[PDB]
Design a protein around this ligand. Structure first.
Ligand SMILES: Nc1ncnc2c1ncn2[C@@H]1O[C@H](COP(=O)(O)OP(=O)(O)NP(=O)(O)O)[C@@H](O)[C@H]1O
Ligand SMILES: Nc1ncnc2c1ncn2[C@@H]1O[C@H](COP(=O)(O)OP(=O)(O)NP(=O)(O)O)[C@@H](O)[C@H]1O
Ligand code: SF4
Lengths: 882, 767
DNA sequence: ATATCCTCTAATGCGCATTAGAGGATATGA
């Protein structure tokens, strides 16, 4: 039936992988076509050339349409039509609110497309009337009066049958018709093929009716095939066992030995781990190469996104998303182009260049560059870093430059090339390429992509993005240019052109694979499709299983195993795993260490760890364990005899509370300075002035309040109105007590010695005043809102150190104990908490407390007592007492 | 069919004719047991196809267990003589929105926001508000009010319009009315009422921004679904055709937005052929502040009618199954006050150790001893405050009982990944350096920390003060002394090599900052010792699982960047810490349970103890505020289900009368919360199956004066007496001072795991 | 060398507003 001398229509039927394409190519060669996919046609042409018109259905339709002459655009068109068809007053009067939405356009486009596929005229749709379909048909008929890839076959067929001479000429020009794909062909393509196969030669319609021209119901002789050539007998047995439930007999290759297995997890992580375990063991132990395994899942976004991430961590390669503009590497040149178009360097457009790939500096190098630049322009108020950056780029600062000169020189070269090349040539030929050549970002990745799997990956992706940007710029022909801009896990539908020794069918849960998710809508598209399913998904499972020839691994979790799993288990060749083993080199070391350091097999594990450590394998040697490290110093902070330590009065209530808090709050360990701190310091500075009136203080505060890092600019006015009242209440307090005390000094520096380890008090007294008795009270203005209690303010460590200094000289006065005061600006007047003067009895106790506190900062091994202030300290993650 | 013999009372519910049905009587009378056994009676006998069954439960665990029970019963019945659809309420609302999202104009592609992302969006909207708030609060403190008002509104379907006339008609009673004998206190209430209408524009702009970004919330999905159900009768007439039997479990705690969405599709008086069953009791309704619906048990007999005005039938089904006597007497006497307040139940008929210790330590010892003597010689504890859960394990672990207690970012293996990622991003976070410098890796001593700080400071009017606090101000951090250690004479010789190594490692890692976000956190974890030391710290009995949460963190990071790692993923994590209290513990595989009372609804255990029953802790009278003290409280005049009495405000002619009305209104609203607490105690008691433990303490932990036991203990003591005869706080302060070694010797002396090791060696040594 | 807070409650001095201190800053689906 397949000879050079032959006529009529013949077909070969049945069998997945049997060799339909091989038979077709053999018949084509012996007698001296169609493929159905732009990638499959390349393979067919390669096979034909190796043995010695490879087109597709849509390509053939386009070719015949072109001979007869002798997707965002359609979405935009329908969106514009919908936007126009809302001001005018035939929708069912309930779809008006949804017309402007972007979800209605896609549904309408899909309905139009499926109407086009089955060969339906707009008048035919208007004959179905359900006014939604009538309105859709009217919309379609209006759209026609206003081509795409969905109606190409229909348009080509419509152009045929009228000339009555082109069809005969084309038929006479074809001697062999080899469709090679008839199981899934649109009815328009089917009738086009039938018309093209009226008389010639031939006209092989092979296809595969088991998995949904025509095959099931037709005349002409048919050929039956039964030997699979690409499936083990066990796999075929499982497939047929599933098939004996469907509303079909074929044997596999006896020369193959196969295995179909079903696995169940206890969690999603367990499934994602045993899949990688099986893949790793298959690649390493069995020895099959990569690209022969594949993971098949119902939907990549639903499951495959997490599966790929959990699988690449185990060392199994994945062959594998963002726009061109959104890529920082491509946007690096876009920023340069924008700067060239504007002609002036901005402030926030320089940090991006200093941080992006053109010139790369880590944040610490940013701090070093900022410090080295601010050392040139020694203004008392430091200038903003962005302001100095542009000046440094333009004019070279001679004050200091050691290693930052190279980066600025490179940026100079790039900018001075781009800004001059645009004053002549066009954008794509003089802006992007000149900038790329001027930048050194071509000789680095070229010698850097060779080595390193981490830096090399970024280099490759960045180079691909740069090439794509260059291609887009070429297709765009300066302001307008900137304005314009391995194991492969894949879906079931993409799992139809693979050999795939090992196939892992992932995500076969009862909630997703038999899709109980309804497929209804507002337009009733599915009702139109059906008028004009478990058994449906079983065919998909069958097709996915049939791609594997050696091993099938059906993975699910127990999130519940579908009845398909129970059905498969009947023809398979244990409690669900909860701790699945891996072959990862970083998991063997972990398990071996966990078993060695446990409260027989220990010698074996130690031998394995020794053999691992003898060849690298980080984490194996005993010296590389974290628990085996040693303290760096273990020596006291100070040890010389006669040493004197300095205690500021503000950090004495913190040393008597938690010495570790003192050690780590100073010496770095405070994660920053809040705005409240600088506002309080500013108010203290304003109050400290001795010769300014209230209006002057308020004006000074208002003139500098603008430069404060307040988000919520409705709050930067509430704070100003509150601190104006703070200044006002300070002034009222000062005027209220003028007749009872009298100031002697303000912000007076306290410094001296109180014990001979010696203790050296140092501090800045906010306000020092004197009474009618000649004493010296001490005042510490505070801008907080919640005052301390009296029984606590009488034990305040800050004041009790200040009036401790005034005893035994120090502040150069009568050296009387005085008293103690604590004024809370903010919360009849400012609330004042008092403290009695240091009596000789209590002075000894306070000296003892100071001495005991000064001895807790001596050596290593600081104490960490739990306080009521543990909720506010930054050193909590490193605190043993938690 | 191989299970329980259904009781006579349960028989009527099991084989009731098609139509609406109510089941009552509460605490073990077989409610969920007559759900799968009623599905099978409506499947095997006939009247339905098991693809037409819909069941709804509050928590997803209950949905899963009901699905498993139903499928098992159906499979067993398949051998004697197409699967159901079981989902939670909110999941069904999401499905309904996806199917018919274009009728009511909401895009079906709408994303759903978490708590952290919602807080971030609300914070940005609040901080980007051009105007004058005239409030004494702060941003991130009025965001916690906007996010609560916008939840209450969407829960009661108020749409922000009626909120603008709340203070009016009420401020006139304090100004126009004459005194009978300002009060300086009603003005605080008025300043509170004038806050809802002040912050209405904020919750309007927030909704506008959420609409403009095609995202919504958990609390807006139900509102949208309910509006769709009420406005359009064409959706119910299709679901009623698809589904013929509908089961509503735990109907006592369903909210107002879920009450008019389940009464418009099913049982609006439309179809009498739809077998609709609702179960639940009016006594275990404990939430009151989340669903905020104390109704829906009485509003069922007139809410799902017979399509002819006949009220739907309610079946008593009274029998105590999961409660042994002498623990049911306490349950039925502690909630005997509900004979007037919430009358919908009569009683249920049938088929203990109390202690009062003088301090918390003694009570902890007593409960631990009682739970250990039943373990060493041969269960759960219900703590109302979860902050109390962790404390009571040290007095119990010392007894030797295995301890199980039930923050992703506080795990010691993940907190070292958030740091060293904060140290990489901004070298000004000093709290992320003390965690690295003093961790098990490179244990720096105190002297070397001091030397590093000295090098850091060596590296370093009224306008110069404000010149600081800028985003580009220099603050003399400690992270730029590691990269310029200076001369190696100020540090110890063993502490300079580590500093140089840290500098080189950070320099290598910071260059990988332009790489995609998910490929950076997976590289830091490669450089650090994680994924190897995480497994080495796990007992052999666990198996191979050591990187569960350390991998779920990476999955969450990849989900977030579906990203900048500096502006985002570090503000995001700090927002999640304060908002979500750690993202998600990454639950174990799975001693005595620890869980809270609110998480112990509809379950059962053998030995259950409610440990802490003193005053102010279990009744929780603290931190409760009515609608006239805080803004975000939705006055009852415009709230659904109005229990929650409304003050008449139309019978007052003097200020004294208004003050009395306000005072008694506050007292009534407080008694409401007291009744809710009593319902909580009733829920806690009935989960016994066996002996029960009740305890209370005199002296707490941080009190100047002792607190007595609560009223619950003072009532239970009377109940048991008509009990173990167990009837200057403290100044002790805990302080901490700042196998592996034995097993390392075997490894040191050394120089089916053999196959794996040789295969890995072959793989590594094959270029 | 420099400060955590909002809120409800109890004493109190010239019945009601002002000041001070104690205790908690819950429970939480999808
Ligand atoms: N005579 C033959 N000798 C050797 N190998 C053969 C022979 N015929 C077919 N094959 C092999 O069988 C396979 C042909 O599969 P194929 O032609 O793709 O079947 P199929 O119908 O396309 N199944 P599908 O991939 O789902 O479309 C190839 O691996 C061929 O090498
Ligand atoms: N006919 C029966 N025979 C024996 N035990 C039963 C019977 N019916 C119910 N039970 C048991 O009584 C208890 C009732 O619990 P369950 O059936 O889960 O409903 P429930 O606990 O009452 N739900 P809820 O009332 O909301 O707390 C379970 O332990 C059942 O196993
Ligand atoms: S949490 Fe408490 S014990 Fe730990 S460092 Fe901070 S203050 Fe000290």
């Amino acid at each position: 039936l397949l000879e050079p001398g032959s006529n009529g229509v013949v077909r070969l039927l049945g069998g997945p992988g049997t060799g339909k394409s091989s038979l077709l190519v053999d018949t084509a060669v012996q007698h001296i076509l169609l493929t159905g996919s732009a990638r499959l046609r390349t393979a067919a042409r390669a096979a034909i050339t190796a043995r010695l018109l490879v087109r597709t259905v849509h390509s053939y339709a386009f070719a015949v349409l072109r001979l007869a002459a002798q997707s965002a655009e359609q979405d935009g068109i329908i969106r514009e039509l919908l936007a126009g068809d809302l001001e005018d007053g035939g929708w069912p009067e309930q779809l008006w609110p949804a017309l402007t939405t972007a979800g209605f356009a896609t549904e309408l486009r899909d309905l139009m497309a499926r109407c086009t596929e089955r060969g339906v005229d707009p008048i035919a749709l208007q004959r179905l009337g359900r006014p939604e379909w009538l309105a859709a048909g009217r919309f379609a008929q209006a759209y026609e009066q206003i081509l795409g890839a969905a109606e190409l076959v229909g348009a080509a067929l419509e152009a045929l049958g009228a000339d009555d001479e082109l069809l005969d000429t084309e038929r006479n020009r074809i001697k062999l018709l080899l469709v090679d794909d008839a199981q899934h062909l649109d009815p328009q393509a089917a009738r086009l093929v039938r018309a093209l196969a009226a008389g010639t030669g031939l006209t092989v319609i092979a296809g595969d009716p088991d998995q949904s021209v025509l095959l099931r119901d037709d005349t002409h002789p048919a050929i039956t095939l039964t030997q699979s050539y690409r499936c083990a007998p066990e796999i075929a047995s499982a497939i047929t066992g599933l098939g004996q439930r469907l509303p079909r007999h074929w044997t596999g290759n006896p020369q193959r030995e196969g295995t179909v297995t079903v696995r169940l997890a206890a969690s999603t992580h367990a499934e994602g781990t045993m899949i990688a375990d099986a893949l790793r063991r298959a690649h390493l132990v069995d020895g099959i190469p990569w690209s022969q395994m594949a993971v098949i899942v119902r939907s990549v976004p639903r499951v495959g996104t997490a599966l790929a991430r959990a699988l690449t961590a185990a060392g199994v390669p994945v062959q594998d998303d963002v726009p061109v503009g959104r890529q920082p590497a491509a946007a690096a040149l876009l920023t340069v182009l924008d700067v060239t178009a504007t002609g002036h360097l901005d402030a926030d457009s320089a940090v991006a260049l200093l941080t992006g790939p053109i010139g790369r500096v880590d944040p610490v190098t940013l701090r070093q560059l900022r410090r080295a630049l601010r050392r040139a322009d020694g203004s008392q108020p430091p200038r903003d870093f962005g302001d100095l950056l542009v000046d440094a780029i333009e004019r070279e600062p001679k004050g200091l430059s050691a290693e930052h000169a190279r980066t600025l020189r490179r940026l100079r070269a790039v900018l001075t090339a781009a800004r001059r090349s645009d004053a002549s040539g066009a954008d794509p030929r003089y802006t992007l390429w000149q900038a790329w050549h001027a930048s050194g970002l071509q000789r680095r990745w070229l010698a850097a992509s060779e080595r390193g799997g981490s830096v090399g990956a970024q280099a490759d992706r960045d180079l691909d993005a740069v090439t794509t940007l260059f291609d887009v710029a070429d297709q765009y022909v300066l302001r307008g240019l900137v304005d314009h801009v391995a194991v492969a896990v894949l879906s079931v539908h993409g799992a139809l052109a693979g050999e795939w020794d090992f196939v892992v069918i992932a995500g076969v849960q009862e909630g997703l694979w038999p899709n109980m998710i309804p497929r209804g809508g507002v337009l009733g598209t599915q009702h139109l499709v059906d008028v004009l399913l478990v058994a449906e998904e079983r065919r998909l499972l069958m097709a996915a299983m049939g791609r594997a020839r050696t091993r099938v691994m059906i993975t699910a979790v127990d999130l519940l195993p579908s009845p398909f799993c129970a059905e498969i288990s009947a023809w398979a060749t244990e409690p669900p795993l909860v701790a699945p083993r891996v072959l990862a080199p970083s998991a063997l070391v972990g398990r071996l260490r966990a078993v060695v350091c446990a409260p027989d097999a220990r010698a074996c594990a130690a031998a394995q760890l020794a053999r691992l450590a003898a060849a690298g394998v980080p984490g194996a040697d005993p010296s590389q364990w974290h628990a085996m490290t040693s303290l760096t110093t273990e020596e006291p902070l100070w040890s010389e005899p006669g040493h004197v330590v300095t205690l500021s009065p503000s950090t004495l209530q913190m040393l008597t509370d938690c010495p570790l808090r003192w050690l780590l709050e100073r010496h770095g360990g405070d994660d920053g300075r809040d705005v409240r701190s600088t506002v309080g310091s500013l108010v203290h500075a304003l109050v400290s002035e001795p010769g300014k009136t209230e209006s002057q203080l308020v004006n000074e505060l208002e003139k500098v309040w603008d430069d404060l890092p307040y988000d919520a600019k409705w709050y930067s006015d509430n704070e100003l109105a509150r601190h104006r009242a703070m200044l006002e209440t300070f002034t009222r307090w000062r005027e209220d007590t003028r007749r009872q005390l009298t100031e002697v000094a303000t912000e007076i520096p306290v410094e001296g010695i109180v014990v001979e380890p010696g203790v050296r008090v140092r501090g800045r007294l906010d306000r020092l005043e004197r009474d009618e008795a000649g004493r010296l009270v001490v005042v510490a203005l505070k801008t907080g809102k919640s005052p301390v209690t009296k029984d606590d303010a009488q034990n305040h460590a800050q004041l009790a150190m200040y009036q401790l200094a005034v005893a035994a000289g120090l502040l150069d006065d009568g050296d009387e104990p005085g008293g103690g005061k604590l004024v809370y600006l903010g919360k009849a007047g400012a609330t004042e908490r008092e403290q009695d003067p240091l009596t000789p009895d209590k002075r000894a106790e306070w000296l003892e407390t100071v001495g005991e506190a000064a001895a807790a900062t001596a050596g290593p091994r600081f104490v960490a007592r739990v306080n009521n202030g543990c909720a506010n300290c930054p050193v909590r993650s490193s605190c043993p007492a938690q | 069919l191989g299970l329980f013999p259904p009781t006579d009372e349960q028989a009527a519910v099991i084989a009731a004719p098609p139509g609406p049905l109510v089941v009552i009587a509460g605490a073990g009378a077989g409610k969920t047991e007559t759900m799968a056994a009623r599905v099978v009676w409506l499947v095997a006998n006939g009247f339905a196809t098991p693809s037409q069954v819909l069941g709804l439960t509050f928590t997803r665990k209950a949905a899963g267990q009901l699905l498993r029970r139903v499928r098992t019963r159906l499979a067993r019945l398949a051998g004697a003589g197409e699967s159901a659809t079981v989902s939670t309420y909110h999941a069904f609302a999401g499905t309904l929105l996806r199917e018919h999202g274009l009728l009511l104009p909401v895009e079906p592609d709408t994303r759903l926001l978490s708590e952290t992302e919602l807080w971030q969006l609300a914070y940005d909207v609040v901080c980007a508000h051009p105007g004058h708030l005239d409030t004494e609060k702060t941003p991130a403190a009025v965001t916690a009010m906007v996010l609560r008002l916008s939840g209450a509104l969407a829960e009661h379907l108020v749409d922000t319009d009626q909120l603008r006339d709340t203070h009016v008609e009420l401020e006139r009673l304090v100004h126009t009315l004459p005194a009978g004998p300002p009060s300086q206190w009603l003005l605080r209430m008025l300043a509170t009422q004038t806050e809802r209408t002040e912050l209405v524009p904020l919750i309007d702009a927030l909704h506008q921004r959420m609409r403009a970004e095609k995202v919504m919330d958990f609390g807006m999905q139900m509102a949208a679904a309910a509006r769709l159900a009420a406005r359009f009768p064409q959706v119910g007439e299709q679901l009623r055709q698809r589904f013929r039997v509908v089961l509503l479990d735990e109907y006592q705690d369903t909210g107002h937005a879920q009450r008019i969405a389940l009464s418009s599709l099913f049982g609006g008086g439309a179809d009498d052929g739809l077998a609709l069953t609702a179960v639940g009791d009016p006594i275990q309704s404990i939430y009151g502040w989340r669903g905020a619906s104390a109704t829906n048990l009485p509003r069922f007999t007139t809410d799902f009618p017979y399509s002819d005005g006949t009220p739907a039938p309610t079946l008593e089904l009274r029998t105590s199954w999961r409660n042994p006597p002498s623990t049911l007497h306490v349950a039925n006497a502690v909630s005997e006050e509900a004979r007037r307040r919430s009358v919908a139940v009569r009683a249920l008929r049938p088929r203990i150790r109390c202690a009062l210790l003088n301090n918390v330590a003694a009570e902890r010892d007593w409960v631990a001893d009682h739970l250990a003597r039943a373990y060493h010689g041969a269960a759960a504890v219900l703590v109302r405050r979860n902050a109390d859960a962790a404390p009571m394990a040290e007095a119990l672990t010392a007894r030797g009982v295995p301890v199980e207690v039930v923050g992703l970012l506080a795990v010691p293996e993940v907190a070292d990944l958030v740091a060293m990622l904060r140290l990489i991003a901004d070298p000004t976070a000093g709290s992320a350096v003390m965690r690295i410098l003093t961790g098990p890796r490179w244990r720096f001593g105190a002297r070397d920390i001091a030397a590093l700080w000295r090098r850091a400071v060596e590296l370093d009017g009224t306008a110069d003060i404000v010149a600081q606090a800028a985003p580009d101000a220099d603050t003399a951090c400690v992270a730029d002394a590691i990269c310029d250690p200076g001369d190696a004479e100020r540090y110890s010789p063993a502490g300079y090599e580590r500093i140089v190594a840290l500098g080189r490692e950070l320099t290598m890692l910071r260059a990988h900052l332009g790489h995609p976000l998910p490929e950076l956190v997976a590289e830091v974890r490669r450089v650090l010792g994680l994924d190897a030391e995480a497994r080495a710290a796990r007992p052999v009995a666990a198996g191979w699982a050591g990187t569960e949460n350390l991998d779920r963190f990476s999955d969450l990071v990849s989900d977030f960047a579906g990203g900048a790692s500096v502006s985002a993923l570090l503000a995001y994590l700090d927002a999640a810490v304060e908002v979500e209290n750690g993202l998600a513990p990454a639950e174990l595989t799975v001693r005595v349970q620890i869980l809270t009372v609110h998480a112990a609804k509809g379950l059962e255990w053998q030995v259950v103890a409610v440990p802490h029953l003193s005053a102010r802790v279990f009744p929780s009278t603290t931190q409760a505020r009515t609608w006239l003290t805080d803004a975000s409280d939705l006055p009852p005049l415009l709230r659904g289900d109005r229990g929650v009495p409304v003050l008449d405000t139309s019978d007052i002619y003097d200020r004294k009368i208004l003050s009395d009305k306000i005072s008694d209104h506050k007292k009534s609203l407080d008694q409401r919360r007291v009744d809710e607490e009593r319902r909580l105690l009733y829920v806690a008691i009935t989960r016994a199956e066996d002996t029960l433990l009740l305890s209370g303490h005199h002296w707490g932990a941080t009190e100047s004066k002792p607190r007595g036991p609560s009223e619950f203990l003072c009532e239970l003591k009377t109940i048991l007496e008509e009990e173990i005869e167990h009837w200057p706080l403290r100044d002790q302060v805990v302080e901490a001072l700042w196998h592996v070694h034995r097993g390392a010797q075997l490894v040191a002396a050394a120089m089916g795991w053999a196959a794996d090791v040789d295969a890995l060696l072959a793989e590594r040594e094959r270029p």
